[PDB]
Amino acid sequence: DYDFLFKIVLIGNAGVGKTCLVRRFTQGLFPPGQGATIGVDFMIKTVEINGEKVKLQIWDTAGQERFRSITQSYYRSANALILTYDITCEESFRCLPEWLREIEQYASNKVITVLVGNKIDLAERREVSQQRAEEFSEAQDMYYLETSAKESDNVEKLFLDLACRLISEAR
């Protein structure tokens, strides 16, 4: 048995690396030749946060617009949403207001949302500056972290810090 169970759902545009992120955390390896998610995928992992056993239930949703009505049906039952963009794609960033709008209608009003900028191993090809992203997230009152599923940068920290904050929330 665990001390806590939380339901985390990753969302964001197609191609931003939501799958490689979940899989790198949950399996410990960056998945080679990863293809687009069809519908929603589900993964599990139990983690120790300061002696507490926390089971994460993680839903990994399709980016592709055509699955969008179905991925949205998963929001209401989530404890947290990991909203994801790709630092090297300005449009995935520019989309974010629209995602927050969705989350407002379809997620629960107790949902925690974090923002992840993925693919920092490609930092020199970013199209959204660190400062832009931090200013957007300061405006949204949203925790922001820059990750690399590929090279592991901040992938563990992402979910372990969110678990810790979900613990505090449950108390």
Ligand SMILES: Nc1nc2c(ncn2[C@@H]2O[C@H](COP(=O)(O)OP(=O)(O)NP(=O)(O)O)[C@@H](O)[C@H]2O)c(=O)[nH]1
């Ligand atoms: N350099 C680099 N490439 C990455 C990283 N994370 C994912 N990618 C790549 O970017 C592409 C998209 O990855 P994927 O995890 O499928 O993204 P997704 O957000 O789940 N897409 P979908 O919504 O279609 O399921 C893949 O080619 C994957 O290898 C990263 O941290 N760095």
Ligand SMILES: [Mg+2]
């Ligand atoms: Mg995917």
